[model samples]
Target: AAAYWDGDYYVKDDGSKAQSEWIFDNYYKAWFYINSDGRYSQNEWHGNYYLKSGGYMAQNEWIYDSNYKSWFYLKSDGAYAHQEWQLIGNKWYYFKKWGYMAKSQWQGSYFLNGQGAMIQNEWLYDPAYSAYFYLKSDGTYANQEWQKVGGKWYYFKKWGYMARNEWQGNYYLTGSGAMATDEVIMDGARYIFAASGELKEKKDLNVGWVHRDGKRYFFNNREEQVGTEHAKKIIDISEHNGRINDWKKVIDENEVDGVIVRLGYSGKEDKELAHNIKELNRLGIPYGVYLYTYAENETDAENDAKQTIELIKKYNMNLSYPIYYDVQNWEYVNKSKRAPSDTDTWVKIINKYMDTMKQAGYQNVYVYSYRSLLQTRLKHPDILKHVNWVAAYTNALEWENPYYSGEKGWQYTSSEYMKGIQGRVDVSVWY
Candidate 1:
């Protein structure tokens, strides 16, 4: 006889009541179907128990041991076995041993970490170690300031500790040879700070040897210290007699570097200029040609460059130096203005003239400033990259903007009153 349990029955071998309980949960819907009893049924106890208990039953899976104390993702492949797990918001994540966890606080910034308990502060805000740190906010990281150079910490307050940053010359030491910043003694002629708080040439009590201008100044051991008087005068052949030929002997004897000869104007100056170029080439002296850039049309500027290059090639001009734009007060030929209608127009003319010249193998060029007035009004961008010579004559050596870039070298004093000269010729930089 059989005790007929007719509700979804399954035969037990010992005839015990067949386990008829069918566990029904929505997550196991794929494993469930309508049985003969008409309720959802499942195949074996594996599906039935999982659907009822609702526990995550990973098939053929194993548990992994981790060091982190937080909840973690089930690594089904168990690839990350014993790594430190990270808590990402509500969920826990254990990445591969070398994998990075990115944490974002705001829109733009994020961070990465590997193994440790990810402290928010530790993961973020790590700074580079500094050996030499500056207390002041100024841009220079000086010897006295703390900084890290080659992964080592060093005391850099002493001179010669840092090569370029420390004081070197004895120009600025006080009478007692003590530095003003600190009372440390400066080894004689070794490292000195400026007394007036500016970098100066080495101090010489004798400040020896009068220059040709008769101004007293000293020459330092470095071959840099020159008498300021040597930088004062600005010489051009455009002025005075066109009488520059008279000073040829003086230029030759003193070893002057170059001479500026002007072109594109009235007077028989071109013939004299050509002859001077011939004679200057014969003497092997470098020479530059200057032109006034008042281009009425595009052809005017182009013609000037063509003529200038032709004369240079024809007369064999060696311009390892700069050609110059001598734009000064021209005393207005037609209109009331000495220059063009506006300062911008003057700059445009100068730029066009310079661009034309630049296209023709001329690299170093310049704008000549007479009385410091010409460059003040016009900002000629083309020639600004070139040398600039401002001719502001003063007996006491006061110049505002002296920009000499191998062009327009200064002529401070003159050998005008010296022996064997018919008229005064302005002496300039010997370079």
Candidate 2:
């Protein structure tokens, strides 16, 4: 008995035909299906099977085409489509669909563009945003890398944001580049800045004495200016001048080079302060101011200094003479017989007053006290280095420097008659 193909059907020698099943041993020598009555059909197949030309493929499955070297989804139409994005199971795979595999694509956290491969540890310039970014080897954005784009340099933080106007250590960035906020030389001179990035001027600066713009300025704590210049022949006056009457007459009649007007006492401004300072400035007589302190402690001393600064600023007066701290026995005679019992405590109080004044930009500070109290009542007389010793003796025409080795000035007499006023006023010689 023999079997042969009759048209589309395979016929047995016994005159019967095979149908509705697959056959391996056939004329095709590959997996082929026989329809009803043993006829071969090209319709869709529904089961997993092997093809001689297409290899093993499942019904509606995704498979790689070796000859084309691309991924495709096997359709029930018995063909594969190219150049498409498809979701397989739970993951997504991009196929060039144009009969080629996708070399690179952008995923969630990284780029797969590594020369026809997935990339890591590389720098990339994104044209979409015109920005440069570094991808780590692990396919994440690189951080803390110093990168230069165009001509300017930028520092990236750990999380990959460019740093601006922030301190990294002793140095800081000024939104343009790294710069030093410490002592930076500008225009052949040293300039510095505060933590808030403000440039420090001579007035804002406080330290030891600093020479800037050919002028000498004094600072207390190394950065703030407390004093401006030295003093000259100076006189002390209060409301006793009685409205000055005529400032030019007073200036001419007195042989004094400057005037020390009483600014305030115990946080209260003297009534004559404004008139005297105005008239003195009008006559072009350089002047300084003094504050009479009734303080028994540090707090009171600080308040006195603060109030004194306020009065000077309020009057717009420039203190050309040393800011004198007038500590006298008469001012405290009713309150106490002598200075504070503990001389050290009094010294500390006076120092606090002077320090507060220095911090407020009035550094030309001097202590005004009579020779008696300075030598006996004020212990540690040598500590009064910036003292203006007042010694009243009718016979001595010149003041003898006592209580301190080098006196800044001397209040030679309290009963000196001047031509402008009927009553006698205190007179001093500034050295």
Candidate 3:
């Protein structure tokens, strides 16, 4: 009678308990099997005893084989699984075909390198991070400082991330490297910083009056004046002052040492600029040019400066006098409605024009403004250092300003009768 003994035990023909390890042919079949008599069996046809040399292992069973010196998994059929993923409990682990753990494996988003450990302290293009990151030694992203990777320089933030298309200090950088442009501002002047972090050679900006070393200095293409003293006799004229068939008539009649001519306004070239400059050059009359600016921003101011330079170079005008920035009530009236109301904005705008012109190799630059604009609209008192001409209509031409050290010239009146022109023309006195 084939009677059951214990759950997996079976009764054999002799009616006794049966239990034994089993193997069939060259493969392991079962760890424990019952005999026909329900007794422990060692018969080759029924079951085999445990064997260390070669034996069967049950499902979910694992063992370390001393011969191979590696771990292996056993199937339900007691067969070893190699070179495949195995599920132990819930976690997944990979084993080589020879039954060894995989050392380095590439998952979709990350890599496990160096003895199956996650990679760190290296540059990686991680899709999960969505960018190129410099992994720190601690397996975290690096940030905030200069880093040299692959012989290229990059800047990181304290947050341990990279910057893309942003400004750092006075320098700007692209995602790849520092940006190089033809026009850059350094130390309040126009110059270029090349891509290799090299400063390109800049042309000498000989324009404008610069107050330095506790004194006012006037610079021109030819020379610089350390003293505030100027020619006592000077005259200013524009298109309003009709054409003089003979420029000598004005120079000889007025006995003026120098003249200030209108170069242009806004972006337009003055109608009389070429004619006046030609006559002045032919007669060797020392003269300067003034541009009436209607610019409201740095870009506009720079364009105005470029236009002024083009006109001066076009006519081959030799400027012995300073290029005056003619600021007047008319400019404010025309542009003030749309212009910035902040005093600092005006100062920056004016400085932009002056700085642009200075960078273009025109150094003999001055400012022409009335007391009202100089005091109220233009709030930056530092501009007083460049205030060479002041317009104040009064019987006595003595000009005084609390901000400026002194003026080089004073436009005393606008309706002054001059011998070279038909109408009452503007006149000025220089010192």
Question: Residue 191: error of model 3 in Å?
Answer: 58
Please write out the lDDT profile of model 1 over residues 1-431, one tens digit for every residue. 43332444533335653443332224343222233443334322232122112222323222222333222233332222234444544333344333323222111122223332222222122333222222212222234433333433223344212322234343232332222332222221323334433444334332212364556343322334444544322244544435445456746554454667765441223646766676667776666777765555446556666777776787777764568766665654666645454666665666766788788878776666564554466544443544455454433224434333442354443423333345666555432
lDDT for model 1: 0.44
Q: What ranges in model 1 sit over 4 Å off?
A: 1-209, 212-235, 238-248, 252-255, 264-269, 296-299, 332-337, 380-383, 396-408, 413-420
Candidate 1 displacement at residue 258 in angstroms: 2.6
Candidate 1: lDDT of 87?
50
- Each candidate's root-mean-square deviation in Å? 23.1, 30.4, 27.3
Reference-based lDDT, residue 344, model 2 = 79
The TM-score leader among the candidates is 3
Model 3 C-alpha lDDT per residue in residues 99-181, reported as the tens digit of each score: 56544444432344544444566775656556565665544556666666665566666645565556666555554543534
Between candidates 1 and 2, which one is better according to lDDT? 2
TM-score-best of 1 and 3: 3
**Residue 191 lDDT in model 1?**
31
Candidates ranked, most accurate by TM-score first: 3, 2, 1
